[PDB]
Design a protein around this ligand. Structure first.
Ligand code: HEM
Ligand code: HEM
Ligand SMILES: [Zn+2]
Ligand SMILES: [Zn+2]
Ligand SMILES: [Zn+2]
Ligand SMILES: [Zn+2]
Lengths: 117, 121
């Protein structure tokens, strides 16, 4: 990475913060690779966040896992962003302990990058 | 409406924004007790996981007010809560604070839900 970009994970259907805001470290890394804009960020709870997909060419595509650190329960993910100036639609799969079982959920949210800073 | 007396009343804890069941339904024992005294309708129910459910509030006179704890059994991890209900024929808005074990940590959460009561017997 070279450029740093702050972001907020917002809800899918409103402008309030998503619960996903607690799961990513700020700011993200921003770089150009083969002419494309690549954003990288640390997922701070590797075990809970089981899958992450972001919008690319009209479909939700799995982010690239760059690095994984099971000892620290973190991983670094990277994804291509077509337009940094618009909210980016994302889809997450998660797992959490619940009343003696494992609750498996999924949700949509949006990344909003602070490009005007 | 109901005369002064004691009844059982089934209920369902529903989500705040839709009519599906809330995850809170697993935390309360059914049916609730309903006591009517001097025209005041009091609902009492057992919270079956005293440590997880840290606070509970229900709508009374247009605002969320803490429920009354009427019995607590720390050894069994349960408690009985009681609250006044103005109209049993409408969903009752509630708020919960909870603590959940979360992979060695304790997650502190909060959520809204609604109690929906069936006919008292
Ligand atoms: C036992 C644990 C959990 C329960 C019972 C739970 C329950 C729910 C429910 C009912 C919804 C609302 C869906 C709708 O719009 O209809 C929701 C949304 C959501 N949940 Fe979970 N959830 C749990 C754990 C988690 C965890 C661990 C995460 C972390 C990734 C998470 C992230 C989300 C997200 C991101 C949303 C969408 C709203 C937002 O952007 O904040 N949930 N969850
Ligand atoms: C690690 C554990 C947990 C996490 C991370 C978690 C996370 C969440 C999240 C993100 C939501 C969605 C909020 C929204 O509407 O945007 C939610 C909703 C909810 N959670 Fe949790 N939660 C956990 C455990 C539990 C537990 C143990 C309870 C039991 C009291 C619980 C009860 C609820 C309730 C009642 C809702 C609202 C949906 C419904 O009525 O079922 N959660 N939780
Ligand atoms: Zn989705
Ligand atoms: Zn005891
Ligand atoms: Zn004892
Ligand atoms: Zn609330």
């Amino acid at each position: 990475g070279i450029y740093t970009i702050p972001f907020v994970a917002k809800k899918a259907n409103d402008d309030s913060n998503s619960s996903m805001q607690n799961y990513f470290n700020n700011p993200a890394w921003l770089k150009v690779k083969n002419g494309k804009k690549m954003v990288a960020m640390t997922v701070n709870d590797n075990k809970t966040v089981t899958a992450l997909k972001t919008t690319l060419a009209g479909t939700l595509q799995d982010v690239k896992v760059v690095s994984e650190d099971k000892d620290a329960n973190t991983r670094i993910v990277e994804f291509e962003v077509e337009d940094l100036n618009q909210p980016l639609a994302a889809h997450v799969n998660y797992e959490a302990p619940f009343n003696g079982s494992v609750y498996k959920g999924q949700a949509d949210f949006r990344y909003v990058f602070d490009t005007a800073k």
